[PDB]
Amino acid sequence: VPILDVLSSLRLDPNFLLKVRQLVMDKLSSIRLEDLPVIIKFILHSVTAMDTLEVISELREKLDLQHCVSSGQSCIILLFDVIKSAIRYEKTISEAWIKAIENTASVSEHKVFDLVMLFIIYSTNTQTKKYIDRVLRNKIRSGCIQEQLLQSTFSVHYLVLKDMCSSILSLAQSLLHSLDQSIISFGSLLYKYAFKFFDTYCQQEVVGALVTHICSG
Amino acid sequence: GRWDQQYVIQLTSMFKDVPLTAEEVEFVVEKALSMFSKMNLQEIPPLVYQLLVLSSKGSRKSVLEGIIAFFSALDKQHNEEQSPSGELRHVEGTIILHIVFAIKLDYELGRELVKHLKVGQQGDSNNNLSPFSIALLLSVTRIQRFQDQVLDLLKTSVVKSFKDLQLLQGSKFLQNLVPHRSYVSTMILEVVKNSVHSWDHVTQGLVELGFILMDSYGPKKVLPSLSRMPNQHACKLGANILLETFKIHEMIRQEILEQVLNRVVTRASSPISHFLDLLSNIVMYAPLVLQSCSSKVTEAFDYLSFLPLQTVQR
Amino acid sequence: VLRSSNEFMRYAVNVALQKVQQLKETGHVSGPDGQNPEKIFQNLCDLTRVLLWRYTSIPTSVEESGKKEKGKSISLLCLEGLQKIFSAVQQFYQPKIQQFLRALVSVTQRTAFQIRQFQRSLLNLLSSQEEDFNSKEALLLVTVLTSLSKLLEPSSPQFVQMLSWTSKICKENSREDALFCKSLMNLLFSLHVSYKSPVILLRDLSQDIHGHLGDIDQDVEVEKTNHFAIVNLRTAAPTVCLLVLSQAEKVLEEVDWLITKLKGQVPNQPVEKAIIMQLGTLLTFFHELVQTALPSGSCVDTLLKDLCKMYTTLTALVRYYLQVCQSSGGIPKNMEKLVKLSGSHLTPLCYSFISYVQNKSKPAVVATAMARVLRETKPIPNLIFAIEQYEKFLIHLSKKSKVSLMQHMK
DNA sequence: ACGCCTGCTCTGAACCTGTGCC
DNA sequence: GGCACAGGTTCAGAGCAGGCGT
């Protein structure tokens, strides 16, 4: 942690700083949880326009969210916030995140984080709204993203997503207007979890949009 | 024949179940609309609901032209009386919401509304739109399909408001001819003034709208008159709406502030004078707020080595 | 000690010019108490008082300096510093323009009182000397008047006498410098238009231009200095041409907008009559310019371009009368009149001028030359195009209101 | 006749020539 | 003949006018 501060404020060669950055990420498995946040910011300040996929790709593999479990959930939130603040501020990072999830359409063993990031990035970043929905259809059609993922997301990460109420449902409304009962199944399950876990306002919006289907669709 | 003022609504709920033609539904509803005038206000909303569900197999142009022409007259008469507010705000609102829950199931309802509220040529926009038409649109921005369409109209109209008036105020010949119909910033602001009685849907649209104008027409030509002034003027407006909005609606003034900070912070990739100039006058009017939003200014400072100097200073 | 050394003075002058220029570019100047707007407002006005007083107390005719030091005359520089002050207070401190003139009753009366001074100064500058007149100081007096003129209220008595005086100066004086003349006419129109349409004015300039330059046919009698005196061989030829047609454009800008809003509608009758009266008057303007022997630069292009834009407005008008005239039986004697002159006087002289200009034919990088000449070949056709597309909507109009408007056309 | 794409028109910036003066 | 201001010229791109699919 402080080392990180010092090596940020010393007068150095960049290749050295890269080397040490990887000397983090190999042991990113191995940080005590509290300390995760503070590193990750550095990594996403240690990004140039050209370093991006490489680092996110490794990180997108490296990062778990499964491993990390009341201080746990608080620290996880801190995490997503820090990310939240990064992704807020680099158009380069948001686009590249998604290009380095869809390049992992291949292994149908890709993980929880690859939803939560989309939903976050949909909510947070708006330029991408078309793109996540394209990817989400293309990936779920492929026999990737399914139940076991989406169930797992809203059983542990409700409190993350509570915030992204309106984001989940903009999506759910985008999915039921489709063909292919695989897609519409997902867009439904969306509504079921949305209505189970969120606020009463979210519940009202669920039934609101259900009616809208029933009378138009 | 004359309708029993008491149960005119209940009679209009009967043509709901009969199969009719266009001419038939049109005749019955234009009479049900003649009847708003000779009623109490609090029963107009459910009548409007039972008009719309009829208008689903009938005239929509007519239903919404009626509600709009009626409330347009109402608000003008409330204005020149000021030169029954605490409930006139409940009706306008409840109606916008009741027409929302319909355009929700009836995507053609929305399209006919929108066609009705086109600028097209600017002479239709100086008889069409209103301080009520626009609360209604800026509720409508909440429908997922409809947000975008709506905003785009408002924004582009906004500019002409500046361009007519700007080109008008160059010239005396033009001022002689036109009897000056209140212009579009004014109207949008009178919404905001009306807003107080807390129809909180319109707000999502305002805030959305407001940063659209500044993000759109910001200083970047400046790091003419034609491509300059009705874009600065536009920007001013964005700012003007939000500051006035921030003053009124204690609920919103968290996420005006964050949405500013957002655009302030990582850029100076692009200029941001305007956002800091707003940011001033936001915090100048009521800076208790940042006590409530303290996490967010904390994590503007964590970029306060990378930020350029003139920004950081201000 | 310091009053003996003239150089010391024109230092502390140049310094002041540097301060005010610095304030324009950034909201603040250099030193301490150069960010606190209050203090800058204080000083500006405190500087102003003295700079005004110098110029007042000491004219430019009391010099013993010669050309080298009259290029940096202490008088001259103080008016340039005035100009930027008056300028840059309107940029920032538009609210305190009252406190600003309280340093020198509403805003407009103080305006007039302050105007008269510079007005008379300029007049004495001009009236006195011809031989080697102060171009610069006369011109930037004109510029200060222009900047500050825009603070008079447009219906005020002081505005009326300003315009009267303005146009009167343009009507009397010779003044061979064209950039000078340019500045006056600019100021005249900028004032004039926010009282009324500037159309007779354009007419008058064109009649004087027609008078002075001569005529296409090499036998038409023209001289009309009588209207406006600040028009020359030198002046009117590249300059008052571009401006007089520039001001015609702003006419037809308003007329295009008029017709867009009118066709929205379908109040009407008065607006049509007004538009046709406008168009009739400035069709006399186009007449005098066409008959003129215009040189072949932007002068000829901007006439031919504006004849296109005259005809395009006439196209929008005729196509307007087609939508509506089917429903009633329209085209009142207003429009019949306009169409008559647009055929009888206008169109055939369009042909005789363009034919004369293209008849007129009296080292080149091949690429640049090819790019230039095939750019410049469009507008003789765009005029013949624009005319024939007028004639189209007139044949359409002739049939679809039951009046044969081709009985007028040759 | 409404939606989508392109290309044209404006706008000012910077470049370097072009010509007048000493 | 060199020293200097003004003009016009090419550019470079923003941002909307209008031809062309359903």
From Swiss-Prot, chain A:
<protein>
    <recommendedName>
        <fullName>Fanconi anemia group D2 protein</fullName>
    </recommendedName>
</protein>
<comment type="function">
    <text>Required for maintenance of chromosomal stability. Promotes accurate and efficient pairing of homologs during meiosis. Involved in the repair of DNA double-strand breaks, both by homologous recombination and single-strand annealing. The FANCI-FANCD2 complex binds and scans double-stranded DNA (dsDNA) for DNA damage; this complex stalls at DNA junctions between double-stranded DNA and single-stranded DNA. May participate in S phase and G2 phase checkpoint activation upon DNA damage.</text>
</comment>
<feature type="region of interest" description="Interaction with BRCA2">
    <location>
        <begin position="6"/>
        <end position="92"/>
    </location>
</feature>
<comment type="subunit">
    <text>Homodimer; cannot be ubiquitinated and does not bind DNA. Part of a FANCI-FANCD2 heterodimeric complex that binds and scans dsDNA for DNA damage. Interacts directly with FANCE and FANCI. Interacts with USP1 and MEN1. The ubiquitinated form specifically interacts with BRCA1 and BLM. Both the nonubiquitinated and the monoubiquitinated forms interact with BRCA2; this interaction is mediated by phosphorylated FANCG and the complex also includes XCCR3. The ubiquitinated form specifically interacts with MTMR15/FAN1 (via UBZ-type zinc finger), leading to recruit MTMR15/FAN1 to sites of DNA damage.</text>
</comment>
<comment type="similarity">
    <text>Belongs to the Fanconi anemia protein FANCD2 family.</text>
</comment>
